[PDB]
Amino acid sequence: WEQYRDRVNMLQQERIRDSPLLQAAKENDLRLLKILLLNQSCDFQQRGAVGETALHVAALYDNLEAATLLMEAAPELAKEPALCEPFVGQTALHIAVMNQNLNLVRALLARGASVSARATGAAFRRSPHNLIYYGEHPLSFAACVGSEEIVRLLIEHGADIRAQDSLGNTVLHILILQPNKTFACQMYNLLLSYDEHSDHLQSLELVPNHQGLTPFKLAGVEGNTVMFQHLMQKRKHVQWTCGPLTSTLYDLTEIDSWGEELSFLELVVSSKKREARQILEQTPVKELVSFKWKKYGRPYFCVLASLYILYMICFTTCCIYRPLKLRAYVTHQDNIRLVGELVTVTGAVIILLLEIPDIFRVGASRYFGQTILGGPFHVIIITYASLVLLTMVMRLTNMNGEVVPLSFALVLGWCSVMYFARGFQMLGPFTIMIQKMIFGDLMRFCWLMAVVILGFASAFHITFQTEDPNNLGEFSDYPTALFSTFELFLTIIDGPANYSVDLPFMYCITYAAFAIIATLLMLNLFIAMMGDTHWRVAQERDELWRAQVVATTVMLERKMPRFLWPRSGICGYEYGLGDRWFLRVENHH
Amino acid sequence: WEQYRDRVNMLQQERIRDSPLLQAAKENDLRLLKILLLNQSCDFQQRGAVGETALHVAALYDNLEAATLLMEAAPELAKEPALCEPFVGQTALHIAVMNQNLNLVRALLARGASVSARATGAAFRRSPHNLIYYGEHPLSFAACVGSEEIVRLLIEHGADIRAQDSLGNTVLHILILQPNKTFACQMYNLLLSYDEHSDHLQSLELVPNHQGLTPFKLAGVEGNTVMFQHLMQKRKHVQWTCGPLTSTLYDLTEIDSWGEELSFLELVVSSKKREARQILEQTPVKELVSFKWKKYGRPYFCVLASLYILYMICFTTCCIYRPLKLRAYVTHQDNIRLVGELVTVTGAVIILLLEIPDIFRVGASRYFGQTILGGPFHVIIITYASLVLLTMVMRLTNMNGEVVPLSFALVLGWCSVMYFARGFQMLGPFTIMIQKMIFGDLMRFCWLMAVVILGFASAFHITFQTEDPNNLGEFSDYPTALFSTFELFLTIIDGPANYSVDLPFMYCITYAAFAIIATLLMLNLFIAMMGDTHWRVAQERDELWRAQVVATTVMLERKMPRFLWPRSGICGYEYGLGDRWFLRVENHH
């Protein structure tokens, strides 16, 4: 409802026009402005629908002569907030900081000011239908514009740093949502120099938000990479540099696991934003995960695939015997016939026993089953789990059949094995493009192919009913006619033909008209097919391939036993360095 | 095991931290550094796990004030090598040459030095898990950094040139592995000016390595082409230049054959490195091999192809008669029936008689059967040789049949003729792309097409077994069902259909679901097919085409008789120039 906000904006700009006693500061009046304030007691009594006063329009643009003489009439006129609903609690300076007019700040500070007044306006929250998000306190509004010395001023009158908004946002992590670099790189250093000077206890960069998240990792998953670059020079310590060779060490007390089950490895694959895929760019991450996948990833990722592919060939093989009397069992083959599914019942309970907790860890299917990188393949994993139970609902009431839902389930079940097809030296990006464009361009012609075939079917059905179903027998009745022309569009079976004394009149030219559409429309599927790989997604299938490896190793580390996983790097102990657990990669120029 | 090297590196950097009596040179201490050396006899006794002493950290970066006063305490402290296993035998200056600090070399040379101490460190050999390879002697370490005058210094104290390492590497050919050009172009001249001054006898550029190879050809097959450019100006001699026309002569006493069976023509097609294909770039090679292929190559490359294509049509034709009694031979047709394979037995012994010596010339199949440019086609040449022998194992025990291995062999045998399909005016790069991408992208869908068809087959088999095999008869049993759906995916034969009183329920919608996968997945093979030729290998199929010609002429020259091959160029004799055998190409500006 942006037009609901647009209801109240133009009310003020001619309400100041209506009453002729207050708007003269907006249009730089001097001589008549010095007349109206002394003859009447009408200085403070002018309030708009917002709660508007004479200083906010004087700081709309800088009215230097307007804010000069009104302190003689009312010096307390600045310290009143606004009262309307979209601008609840917002005062005089709150517009006079984003103007970056340093000649304006000498007046209203020494003549009565209060920096602790926060700005709780309704147009100030983070929202998709609101453009800017600049924070709560005017220190944050000074930090957003990127001015170096006016932010010098308000600190020198007892400014607080640790104050947040109603949704827990401090002064620091509002920089990483804003895309500019050239002012956020320099302002970060001298503002972090003005700490408590007892910095490790009640740390200002370790205090969580209202969600409870350490504000450095917001920059990690929203991926403004220059902060991820710039904080790594505070942790750097050189060891030896010899010519074009140098050494470096890697501190990863935050890049770890068991951090109260809120590590960023859980959450870098959780974002739905497109820039966030390339956070694997710099050396603290990429050579770490490349060692973690080479040392423990590949020699364990294949053995469960082996024990799965021999699981399902056994369940496939044992189900080629189950119809036995459809056209009470004690024989010799009945023992292996029994254990063939007595294995798969305790093998089929585990596929829900391991796949319900990651469902209620997320909380909803709307944040589980949409990710391309996490994998939409779970929709067949969940329906493989129910068939076995259903297979058992038949043997309490003894209904006939119940191998036809098995027929409809076993193919999809067998198709499930290709989710571990990504872990090889190859074959990864081949299965990514198909899942990328089933949703993309297979959807198009499936809404146009069903709508074109049934008119063909009705035109074919209305003609051959004047003759017998014995001479041709292909187009008999309504259900098989649409099926016959639907599969006849795909040039699978040859068109029907007979040569006798009976011959239909209309069928030939409409068959040619069907062929003149089947010779180009099925091939116009191929051009919408082809237009994606050439320029559209040619770069997409490799970065997703190098992101599924960190996805599957973070998903696999949090389920397997501790015995199979130590943490990488070096020990650090026997050396008086503390519990910091460094790491080396070697760089060359 | 790079982490095994990483076990011992950080031990030193805080062991110097632990003992407070030796590390003060590393952190530029002056006043307290002058105290600890006189009160104790503790100057030489500090040794680390490497064998570390006080001068190596003083030459880590340049500690000018540290290496000033320790010669008053121990001037012999520089001439001790290291003792640990990864740094066996490496002394003080060995780090003080790669710093290129010319103010440092005035101290430790005149106060006791020895340039003959080689550096036998374990991190100094050529290895894939080690980054740099800079040589053995500090002359080579001076040559690698590319400094012009500090290499002036150590020559002036009796430096040797002809010394090598344990694997035979002199000072010269360590330049061609390093990719830089702008310092290797100028340093090569004045260092070659400092020869023995009796240069042709015991020549420094003709001394072989430990493998026994003349070090100029390392630059040929590793292909740093600027050395191949720069040495050709020492052999140049102008004759006449008239306007935009000039003449030049070509000395090829090294570009020849019979050079103790170790010519570079054998070995330019042997490398597995990608830059090495474009060594056909400059005029001593390209116009030479273009004359060798035009004069003798094409009028001889076709006649053996003719005598091969009439060989195998005769062997094909004679084998359409051999089953004679499967549903002792003296007739009139038995004479030509006998000689039809009496020709091919002595024609089939030669295909192994000529193709075992190039096997044990290489030594293993791992360096024979992998080359794309040499040709992986030998795998059918080796299996054509065994069928004939097998055909003869039947006629000692008289077993029934043995025309079915002939059936399985004759097609592949007939497919062998296209290895000489490269020698024409055309048709070369057409057969290169297919062999390039059988290994490339035919491998992908062959691991996904077999895994998808058998679930379809089991779903088709589980339904039709409730009915008779008489009404349809297509899906009868397990072995033919997978075969039937495997060839039915390829839209070769039409799908089965019948119209009677019996009609299956589940088959129609799963047939439509098979068709909705067969209409896009077989075409998603074509996009992985298409993505290679457009930008991926469009440049590859012509340079390989102009490299197979030098491959086949060097392979053909070393097998055919001398009568059919003289060497190209001009004679040189009747003229007092010596046995040098020049060549002319003409150049235009």
Ligand SMILES: Clc1ccc(CO[C@@H](Cn2ccnc2)c2ccc(Cl)cc2Cl)cc1
């Ligand atoms: Cl009735 C019927 C059921 C399933 C399929 C084909 O399987 C679908 C599964 N699927 C998708 C949406 N609803 C089920 C599939 C999905 C993803 C990939 Cl990568 C590959 C495949 Cl084969 C065809 C007909």
Ligand SMILES: Clc1ccc(CO[C@@H](Cn2ccnc2)c2ccc(Cl)cc2Cl)cc1
């Ligand atoms: Cl059982 C069977 C045997 C052979 C073929 C086809 O021949 C293969 C030979 N080949 C390759 C790997 N093992 C044998 C071939 C290889 C290279 C090229 Cl350029 C062209 C071809 Cl046709 C098909 C089935």
